[PDB]
Every structure is written in structure tokens, then in C-alpha cells.
Motif scaffolding. Structure first.
Motif, PDB file in Angstrom:
ATOM      1  N   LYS A 139     131.432  17.905 -56.370  1.00  0.00           N
ATOM      2  CA  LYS A 139     131.371  18.529 -57.693  1.00  0.00           C
ATOM      3  C   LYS A 139     131.893  17.603 -58.818  1.00  0.00           C
ATOM      4  CE  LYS A 139     132.888  22.671 -60.264  1.00  0.00           C
ATOM      5  NZ  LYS A 139     133.830  23.834 -60.231  1.00  0.00           N
ATOM      6  N   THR A 140     132.964  16.863 -58.556  1.00  0.00           N
ATOM      7  CA  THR A 140     133.524  15.972 -59.569  1.00  0.00           C
ATOM      8  C   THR A 140     132.533  14.866 -59.957  1.00  0.00           C
ATOM      9  OG1 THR A 140     135.802  16.331 -58.788  1.00  0.00           O
ATOM     10  CG2 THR A 140     135.380  14.398 -60.157  1.00  0.00           C
ATOM     11  N   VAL A 141     131.849  14.312 -58.956  1.00  0.00           N
ATOM     12  CA  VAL A 141     130.859  13.255 -59.168  1.00  0.00           C
ATOM     13  C   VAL A 141     129.556  13.761 -59.804  1.00  0.00           C
ATOM     14  CG1 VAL A 141     129.370  11.562 -57.989  1.00  0.00           C
ATOM     15  CG2 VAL A 141     131.746  11.857 -57.237  1.00  0.00           C
ATOM     16  N   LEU A 142     129.043  14.889 -59.314  1.00  0.00           N
ATOM     17  CA  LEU A 142     127.728  15.351 -59.748  1.00  0.00           C
ATOM     18  C   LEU A 142     127.842  16.170 -61.033  1.00  0.00           C
ATOM     19  CD1 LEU A 142     125.953  16.523 -56.402  1.00  0.00           C
ATOM     20  CD2 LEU A 142     125.881  14.280 -57.515  1.00  0.00           C
ATOM     21  N   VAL A 143     128.967  16.844 -61.203  1.00  0.00           N
ATOM     22  CA  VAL A 143     129.116  17.755 -62.331  1.00  0.00           C
ATOM     23  C   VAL A 143     130.153  17.269 -63.337  1.00  0.00           C
ATOM     24  CG1 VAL A 143     129.584  20.109 -63.062  1.00  0.00           C
ATOM     25  CG2 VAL A 143     128.483  19.674 -60.844  1.00  0.00           C
ATOM     26  N   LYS A 144     131.406  17.179 -62.903  1.00  0.00           N
ATOM     27  CA  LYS A 144     132.529  17.040 -63.831  1.00  0.00           C
ATOM     28  C   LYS A 144     132.574  15.693 -64.528  1.00  0.00           C
ATOM     29  CE  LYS A 144     135.413  20.464 -61.484  1.00  0.00           C
ATOM     30  NZ  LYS A 144     136.807  20.910 -61.191  1.00  0.00           N
ATOM     31  N   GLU A 145     132.271  14.625 -63.799  1.00  0.00           N
ATOM     32  CA  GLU A 145     132.304  13.287 -64.382  1.00  0.00           C
ATOM     33  C   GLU A 145     130.926  12.632 -64.449  1.00  0.00           C
ATOM     34  OE1 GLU A 145     134.963  12.179 -65.786  1.00  0.00           O
ATOM     35  OE2 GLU A 145     136.342  13.717 -65.039  1.00  0.00           O
ATOM     36  N   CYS A 146     129.876  13.438 -64.571  1.00  0.00           N
ATOM     37  CA  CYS A 146     128.519  12.890 -64.692  1.00  0.00           C
ATOM     38  C   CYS A 146     128.378  11.972 -65.926  1.00  0.00           C
ATOM     39  CB  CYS A 146     127.494  14.028 -64.755  1.00  0.00           C
ATOM     40  SG  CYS A 146     125.784  13.502 -65.002  1.00  0.00           S
ATOM     41  N   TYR A 147     128.685  12.503 -67.102  1.00  0.00           N
ATOM     42  CA  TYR A 147     128.474  11.774 -68.357  1.00  0.00           C
ATOM     43  C   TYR A 147     129.382  10.567 -68.566  1.00  0.00           C
ATOM     44  CZ  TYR A 147     125.560  15.717 -69.701  1.00  0.00           C
ATOM     45  OH  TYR A 147     124.562  16.664 -69.759  1.00  0.00           O
ATOM     46  N   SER A 148     130.603  10.646 -68.054  1.00  0.00           N
ATOM     47  CA  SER A 148     131.600   9.618 -68.320  1.00  0.00           C
ATOM     48  C   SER A 148     131.614   8.487 -67.288  1.00  0.00           C
ATOM     49  CB  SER A 148     132.981  10.256 -68.385  1.00  0.00           C
ATOM     50  OG  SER A 148     133.321  10.805 -67.122  1.00  0.00           O
ATOM     51  N   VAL A 149     131.323   8.809 -66.029  1.00  0.00           N
ATOM     52  CA  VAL A 149     131.508   7.844 -64.943  1.00  0.00           C
ATOM     53  C   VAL A 149     130.305   7.678 -64.011  1.00  0.00           C
ATOM     54  CG1 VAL A 149     132.909   7.200 -62.946  1.00  0.00           C
ATOM     55  CG2 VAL A 149     133.978   8.376 -64.898  1.00  0.00           C
ATOM     56  N   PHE A 150     129.683   8.791 -63.623  1.00  0.00           N
ATOM     57  CA  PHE A 150     128.650   8.759 -62.584  1.00  0.00           C
ATOM     58  C   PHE A 150     127.308   9.185 -63.144  1.00  0.00           C
ATOM     59  CE2 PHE A 150     132.721   9.715 -60.452  1.00  0.00           C
ATOM     60  CZ  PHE A 150     132.794   8.630 -59.593  1.00  0.00           C
ATOM     61  N   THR A 151     126.796   8.407 -64.091  1.00  0.00           N
ATOM     62  CA  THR A 151     125.680   8.862 -64.902  1.00  0.00           C
ATOM     63  C   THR A 151     124.353   8.437 -64.317  1.00  0.00           C
ATOM     64  OG1 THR A 151     127.148   8.432 -66.793  1.00  0.00           O
ATOM     65  CG2 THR A 151     124.889   9.123 -67.287  1.00  0.00           C
ATOM     66  N   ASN A 152     124.341   7.292 -63.637  1.00  0.00           N
ATOM     67  CA  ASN A 152     123.087   6.667 -63.233  1.00  0.00           C
ATOM     68  C   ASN A 152     122.889   6.566 -61.742  1.00  0.00           C
ATOM     69  OD1 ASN A 152     122.725   6.212 -66.000  1.00  0.00           O
ATOM     70  ND2 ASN A 152     123.990   4.357 -65.864  1.00  0.00           N
ATOM     71  N   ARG A 153     121.617   6.510 -61.354  1.00  0.00           N
ATOM     72  CA  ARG A 153     121.252   6.201 -59.976  1.00  0.00           C
ATOM     73  C   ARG A 153     121.264   4.703 -59.750  1.00  0.00           C
ATOM     74  NH1 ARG A 153     117.747  10.592 -61.225  1.00  0.00           N
ATOM     75  NH2 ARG A 153     118.538  12.492 -60.203  1.00  0.00           N
ATOM     76  N   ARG A 154     121.088   4.320 -58.496  1.00  0.00           N
ATOM     77  CA  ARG A 154     121.001   2.916 -58.132  1.00  0.00           C
ATOM     78  C   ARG A 154     119.685   2.315 -58.646  1.00  0.00           C
ATOM     79  NH1 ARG A 154     121.759   0.836 -51.998  1.00  0.00           N
ATOM     80  NH2 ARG A 154     122.237   3.055 -51.673  1.00  0.00           N
ATOM     81  N   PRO A 155     119.730   1.115 -59.253  1.00  0.00           N
ATOM     82  CA  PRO A 155     118.481   0.387 -59.549  1.00  0.00           C
ATOM     83  C   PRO A 155     117.798  -0.027 -58.247  1.00  0.00           C
ATOM     84  CG  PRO A 155     120.384  -0.520 -60.753  1.00  0.00           C
ATOM     85  CD  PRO A 155     120.925   0.364 -59.675  1.00  0.00           C
ATOM     86  N   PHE A 156     116.467  -0.146 -58.191  1.00  0.00           N
ATOM     87  CA  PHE A 156     115.831  -0.305 -56.867  1.00  0.00           C
ATOM     88  C   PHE A 156     114.677  -1.309 -56.686  1.00  0.00           C
ATOM     89  CE2 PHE A 156     111.925   2.090 -57.650  1.00  0.00           C
ATOM     90  CZ  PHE A 156     112.254   2.830 -58.763  1.00  0.00           C
ATOM     91  N   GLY A 157     114.309  -2.030 -57.738  1.00  0.00           N
ATOM     92  CA  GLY A 157     113.264  -3.031 -57.601  1.00  0.00           C
ATOM     93  C   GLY A 157     112.618  -3.190 -58.941  1.00  0.00           C
ATOM     94  N   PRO A 158     111.584  -4.046 -59.029  1.00  0.00           N
ATOM     95  CA  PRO A 158     110.985  -4.325 -60.330  1.00  0.00           C
ATOM     96  C   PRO A 158     110.131  -3.137 -60.770  1.00  0.00           C
ATOM     97  CG  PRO A 158     109.716  -5.412 -58.637  1.00  0.00           C
ATOM     98  CD  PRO A 158     110.871  -4.732 -57.936  1.00  0.00           C
ATOM     99  N   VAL A 159     110.382  -2.644 -61.969  1.00  0.00           N
ATOM    100  CA  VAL A 159     109.871  -1.342 -62.344  1.00  0.00           C
ATOM    101  C   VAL A 159     109.094  -1.391 -63.669  1.00  0.00           C
ATOM    102  CG1 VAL A 159     111.164   0.363 -63.683  1.00  0.00           C
ATOM    103  CG2 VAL A 159     110.990   0.609 -61.192  1.00  0.00           C
ATOM    104  N   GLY A 160     109.283  -2.466 -64.434  1.00  0.00           N
ATOM    105  CA  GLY A 160     108.522  -2.661 -65.660  1.00  0.00           C
ATOM    106  C   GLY A 160     108.727  -1.546 -66.672  1.00  0.00           C
ATOM    107  N   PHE A 161     107.644  -1.093 -67.299  1.00  0.00           N
ATOM    108  CA  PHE A 161     107.742  -0.059 -68.326  1.00  0.00           C
ATOM    109  C   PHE A 161     108.243   1.270 -67.756  1.00  0.00           C
ATOM    110  CE2 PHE A 161     104.488   3.251 -67.864  1.00  0.00           C
ATOM    111  CZ  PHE A 161     103.686   2.730 -66.865  1.00  0.00           C
ATOM    112  N   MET A 162     108.219   1.409 -66.437  1.00  0.00           N
ATOM    113  CA  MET A 162     108.643   2.666 -65.842  1.00  0.00           C
ATOM    114  C   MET A 162     110.169   2.819 -65.870  1.00  0.00           C
ATOM    115  SD  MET A 162     106.201   4.760 -65.089  1.00  0.00           S
ATOM    116  CE  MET A 162     106.923   5.805 -63.829  1.00  0.00           C
TER     117      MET A 162
END
Ligand code: HEM
Ligand SMILES: CC(C)(C)OC(=O)NCCCCCC(=O)NCc1cccnc1
Length: 460
Positions: free
Chosen positions: A63-86
Motif C-alpha cells: 500500500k505504501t508503494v502503490l498508494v501512499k508514496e506513488c507521486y513522491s517516490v514510486f511514480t514510474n515503471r521500469r524502462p524496457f527497450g527502445p520505444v521511440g514516440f511511444m
């Protein structure tokens, strides 16, 4: 890098030079997470190449990771390869660009907009049945991913763009042709494994415009969206309630951002929907009592094959239970992930900047400490009598918090509408060629080892 979890006193499988722990993926993600959970406990760490990944299982910490600290700390997923405009697709976007896109697209997925889409979705349930009935009179075993794949595409093309195709019988329509190539990524396939061991090669692929989304497909859709929207609507008088229109009216979104979302929605909904529907029908075929109970509920709510509506779908309790229990067994995202943006201490544990925090949904969905006989298909788990015992940070088939599945209500409504129409007309039964019990693939996708095949019988 490989000394991190050792330094933090965090347990996990000892990594090999260069590879980290990727050789442990030889039986797929889910079995790796099950085994680590069993042998290391509440938390463990491993390495995807040089990338540290911290697995967590405590509901309060999740809950702390997905909800409570989403905006401040855990906002993004892992980058995963060349994605271009996507890069501007909402699922791939980061920080403020994500925040903005999630705001622009939120109104598009409200219950109210969903309700307006239901007539369009329902029409392809009728198409599904008529196509299905053609094989229910044949007697030949039916490959579910194929019939549900065509259904899934039909709904996507119409609710995305107002393109109205019977894709099963129009297999080389160019629109169907391209969109069919938007399948889920296998992150254990040779390309993505290589990118995991050589991540320093991603910028080289980007500068050469090499993209993990097929350029031919993305080119087609871009031009289509541009030409469908070019001036075709130079009349206005027509209304329109598809995602393109909703996004058009929400134009604020860049034109390129718009097309990025059009594509990611196809990619998000196409194979996921048909996959889950296949898993559901497999469970129903191998549990005739559940299939019969569901058909009884459907007939009670919708007597004499009455067409499903928005509100009558939401009235079906057992249908909801069957869908939810299938997603418990088969949470096709398998894992949830967030990158730690800065050194933090959450729920008593220090997590370094740059670590990927992972929530192993598949392993938690089958964790014996939360689920009685976790390997068994038991819809009553989700009954009003029993469901209160279910922790929403343990059961996470659509994720949780601000970055959860934005398409959740739509996907559920889509699958329920299909299931209702299909079950009104047919019963589904195992074949000699049906794989029982079902085995999962060892690749990077949660899918059957061999396709689900069933006999389809007309109810009268
Ligand atoms: C049964 C079908 C589906 C399942 C099981 C599913 C599951 C998931 C899961 C687990 C996530 C990650 C949530 C998280 O990280 O907390 C996700 C994200 C997402 N899904 Fe779905 N999904 C489904 C269908 C769809 C559909 C039909 C759409 C769009 C029309 C969609 C659009 C998205 C988007 C855009 C995200 C990323 C949201 C963001 O980053 O803000 N999904 N989905
Ligand atoms: C459900 C499948 C399609 C297997 O993929 C997931 O695990 N979904 C959760 C990730 C959220 C974003 C999914 C998504 O549609 N965005 C692009 C993408 C594609 C693959 C991996 N990461 C990002």
C-alpha cells in the motif's frame, strides 16, 4: 552493483557476473517468484542483469508503494527497450508527463462513458455467437484464443475508432491485419534478454529508430488516425462515442500523444482480453457445476436470452465471482513494478534510489497464508460471505493506486458482456484434445502451454 542486497542484509538468489539472476527465469516469471517467496520469505532481492529488484509481499508495505508514496517516490515503471514516440503512451510515460496524461484520459474511462459504449460492445457479442454457432453445428473442437481473439479485436476496432469489422471472417482486412500484430511483449525472448544483459545498447537502437512496437503497424495506425480524423468528421453531425472521439474532444493532448494512446489501448486490450476469456471458459468447461450455476443466474437476470445491458451486467454476482477467481489464478500482468526515485525508508525498511520495487501478484494470489487451497478454482472465495477476508494489496490483478489499470472497468464489462451472450446460447465442454489439467507456458507470458480447445454445444 551485485553487492547491494548483501550490504542491506536482504536475502535472495546470489547473482552471476553480467547475468545477475536471469538464468533463474528458465521456467518463467511466475515459478521464479513462487520459489523465491517460499525460500526467502517476506522480502527478497535479485538482479535483472545489473538492475536490482526488490520483491515485497507485506500488504502494508505494498500500500505504501502503490498508494501512499506513488507521486513522491514510486511514480514510474521500469524502462524496457527502445520505444521511440511511444514514450508518450500513458503506461510508459513518467513523472509529470504521466500525471498529465492520466488526467486527460481519466474522464474517458468513467462509468458514464462506459455505459455509452455498451451498445457497441454488445453488437460484437452477437457477432461472436453467430460465428460460434457455425462451429456448434459442426461438432469440431474450438480454439478459444482464436474465437475470443476475433471478438477482442472486433470490440477494439469499433470502440477505438468506430471501425466496424467481422474480423473472424475478414482476416486480411488491412485494419485487422495491422492491429493483430500488437501482441504482448515476451520479456524472456532473446531480444529482451539481450537488452537486459546489454542495457547500454538501448540508446544505440533509439538513434537508429529501431522500435519494439512495429514501425509498419504504428505507421498504418498513425496515418489512419490522421486520415480518419483528417477531415472525415468535416460534417460533425454524427455524434460518436469511441475513444478517438473522446480524446478528440479532449483536445490538452498533443496529436502525437493522442495516437500514442490509441495504440497503447489496442496493445493493452487485445491479447489480455482474449487470454482472460480463454482461461475463464477453460475453468467453466472443467467445472460444469459452476458453468451451470452461472447460466442459471444469467437466465434469471435475462430471461429468454434477453440482451445484456450495463445495469444487468452489474447485477450478476456469480458472474463477477467467476471472473475475479479466474483473475486470481491467472493474473496476466504477473508482477507490478515501480522504480524507487530517491532513498527512502518505508514501513521500517531502507530502499535505495534506483531499485525496482516489485509486487509479485501471481505469487501472492497463490500464497497459502491468504488463500485456502490456492491452486483450486473456487468462486465462492469472492462471495459476499467470504470476500471481506480478501486483502486488496494481496489480490491485485489490475494493480492499485493512482497508476492502476485505467482500463479496468472497461475490460471487466467487455468480458462480462461476451461471457453472458456466449453462455446464453452455448455450453462448453472438454475435448479429448483438451489439456487437463491446464499447464502454463515457461516463456515470459502467462498463457497455457498449449492453446485451450473445447467442444461447443448449442443450448437447443
Ligand atoms: C483483463 C484485462 C486487463 C488486465 C488484467 C489488466 C491489468 C493491468 C495491470 C495489472 C496494470 C498495472 C497496474 C499497476 O501497475 O498498478 C495495468 C495497467 C494499465 N492498463 Fe490494463 N489490464 C487489462 C486491460 C486493459 C484495457 C482494456 C485497457 C485500455 C482500454 C488497459 C489499459 C491500461 C493502461 C493505460 C495501464 C497503465 C496505466 C498508467 O500507467 O497510468 N488495460 N493493467
Ligand atoms: C498484461 C501484459 C500485457 C502481459 O502486460 C503487463 O504486465 N501489464 C502491466 C504493465 C503496465 C503497462 C502495460 C502496457 O500496456 N504498456 C506498455 C508496456 C508493455 C509491456 C511492459 N511494460 C509496458
Amino acid at each position: 552493483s551485485h553487492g547491494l542486497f548483501k550490504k542491506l542484509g536482504i536475502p535472495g538468489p546470489t547473482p552471476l557476473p553480467f547475468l545477475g539472476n536471469i538464468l533463474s527465469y528458465h521456467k518463467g516469471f511466475c515459478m521464479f517468484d513462487m520459489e523465491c517467496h517460499k525460500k526467502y520469505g517476506k522480502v527478497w532481492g535479485f538482479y535483472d542483469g545489473q538492475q536490482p529488484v526488490l520483491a515485497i509481499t507485506d500488504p502494508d508495505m505494498i500500500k505504501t508503494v502503490l498508494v501512499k508514496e506513488c507521486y513522491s517516490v514510486f511514480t514510474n515503471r521500469r524502462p524496457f527497450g527502445p520505444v521511440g514516440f511511444m514514450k508518450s503512451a500513458i503506461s510508459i510515460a513518467e513523472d509529470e508527463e504521466w500525471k498529465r496524461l492520466r488526467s486527460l484520459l481519466s474522464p474517458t474511462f468513467t462509468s458514464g462513458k462506459l455505459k455509452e459504449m455498451v451498445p457497441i460492445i454488445a453488437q460484437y457479442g452477437d457477432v461472436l455467437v453467430r460465428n460460434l454457432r457455425r462451429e456448434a453445428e459442426t461438432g469440431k473442437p474450438v480454439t478459444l484464443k482464436d474465437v475470443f481473439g476475433a471478438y477482442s479485436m472486433d470490440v477494439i476496432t469499433s470502440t477505438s475508432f468506430g471501425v466496424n469489422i467481422d474480423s473472424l471472417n475478414n482476416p486480411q482486412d488491412p485494419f485487422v491485419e495491422n492491429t493483430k500484430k500488437l501482441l504482448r511483449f515476451d520479456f524472456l525472448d532473446p531480444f529482451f534478454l539481450s537488452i537486459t544483459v546489454f542495457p547500454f545498447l538501448i540508446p544505440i537502437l533509439e538513434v537508429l529508430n529501431i522500435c519494439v512496437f512495429p514501425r509498419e503497424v504504428t505507421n498504418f495506425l498513425r496515418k489512419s488516425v490522421k486520415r480518419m480524423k483528417e477531415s472525415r468528421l468535416e460534417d460533425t453531425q454524427k455524434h460518436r462515442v469511441d475513444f478517438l472521439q473522446l480524446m478528440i474532444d479532449s483536445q490538452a493532448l498533443s496529436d502525437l500523444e493522442l495516437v500514442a494512446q490509441s495504440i497503447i489501448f489496442i496493445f493493452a486490450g487485445y491479447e489480455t482480453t482474449s487470454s482472460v476469456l480463454s482461461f475463464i471458459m477453460y475453468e467453466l468447461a472443467t467445472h460444469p457445476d459452476v458453468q451451470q450455476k452461472l447460466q442459471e443466474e444469467i437466465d434469471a437476470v435475462l430471461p429468454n436470452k434477453a440482451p445484456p445491458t450495463y445495469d444487468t451486467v452489474l447485477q450478476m454476482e456469480y458472474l463477477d465471482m467467476v471472473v475475479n477467481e479466474t483473475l486470481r489464478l491467472f493474473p496476466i500482468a504477473m508482477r507490478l513494478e515501480r522504480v524507487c526515485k530517491k532513498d527512502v525508508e518505508i514501513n521500517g525498511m531502507f530502499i535505495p534510489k534506483g531499485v525496482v520495487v516489485m509486487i509479485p501478484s501471481y505469487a501472492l494470489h497463490r500464497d497459502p497464508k491468504y488463500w485456502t487451497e490456492p491452486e483450486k478454482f473456487l468462486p465462492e472465495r469472492f462471495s459476499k460471505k467470504n470476500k471481506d477476508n480478501i486483502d486488496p494489496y494481496i489480490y491485485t490483478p489490475f494493480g492499485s493506486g493512482p497508476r492502476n489499470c485505467i482500463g479496468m472497468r472497461f475490460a471487466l464489462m467487455n468480458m462480462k458482456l461476451a461471457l453472458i451472450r456466449v453462455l446464453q446460447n452455448f455450453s462448453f465442454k472438454p475435448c479429448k484434445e483438451t489439456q487437463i489439467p491446464l499447464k502454463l507456458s515457461l516463456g515470459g507470458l502467462l498463457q497455457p502451454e498449449k492453446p485451450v480447445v473445447l467442444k461447443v454445444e448449442s443450448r437447443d
